[PDB]
């Protein structure tokens, strides 16, 4: 199953994604800690997109896709580049897989497995 979101690339809306995310992550039955980590990792990917819109002074939009599978959650955040930060460290430590690719703004594809 695939849930898709599109929000304006403004900071008000990252908190919105965390809700939607905790929604999906609960329905899939992750832990509290597992949901609390997923919330951090997804905000981090969204924050790079929001920040990258300040520098360009664009009004941009973030695209977020939750791919809910039998064994894992896949989250894709795209921003229709990468200079590694503290935030990117957090996504990798907390998640099972992270894959970054530009130049499509950037698109971050991260995965977490059910335990």
């Amino acid at each position: 199953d695939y849930i898709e979101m599109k929000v304006p690339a403004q900071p008000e809306y990252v908190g919105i994604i965390r809700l939607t995310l905790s929604g999906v992550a609960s329905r899939m039955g992750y832990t509290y800690d597992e949901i609390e980590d997923l919330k951090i990792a997804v905000s981090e990917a969204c924050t790079n997109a929001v920040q990258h819109a300040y520098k360009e002074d664009k009004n941009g939009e973030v695209s977020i896709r939750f791919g809910v599978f039998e064994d894992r959650l896949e989250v894709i955040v795209a921003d229709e580049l990468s200079e590694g930060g503290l935030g990117l460290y957090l996504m990798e430590t907390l998640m099972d897989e992270v894959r970054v690719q530009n130049h499509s703004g950037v698109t971050v594809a991260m995965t977490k497995y059910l335990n």
Binding site: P11, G15, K39, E44, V50, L90
Partner: protein
């Protein structure tokens, strides 16, 4: 959203933070608490009621710490979640900032 309560008494300041520290609410926190480390003072930050934090909050906390040190102050962050402490650990900041 986020709330910040400053009560300065006796050249030592207890700050309680409550809510979410994310990209949206971090400049508000940085702003309300950026100068107190620019003068340097005896600073206490109570994170009892923080329900969410990411690298944006970590970034300002290391920002306040650096100024308290450059120069002339003290900084303690206290009453942290088991996981807020986990977070400061995971990022290489646990042994360079006073945590409780």
């Amino acid at each position: 959203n986020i709330n910040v309560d400053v009560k300065q008494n006796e050249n030592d300041i207890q700050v309680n933070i409550a809510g979410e520290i994310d990209v949206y609410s971090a400049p508000v926190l940085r702003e309300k608490l950026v100068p107190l480390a620019e003068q340097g003072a005896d600073l206490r930050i109570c994170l009892k009621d923080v329900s969410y934090m990411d690298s944006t909050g970590l970034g300002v906390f290391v920002g306040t710490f650096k100024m308290v040190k450059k120069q002339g102050g003290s900084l303690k962050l206290e009453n942290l979640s088991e996981r807020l402490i986990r977070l400061f650990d995971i990022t290489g900041l646990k042994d360079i900032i006073d945590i409780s």
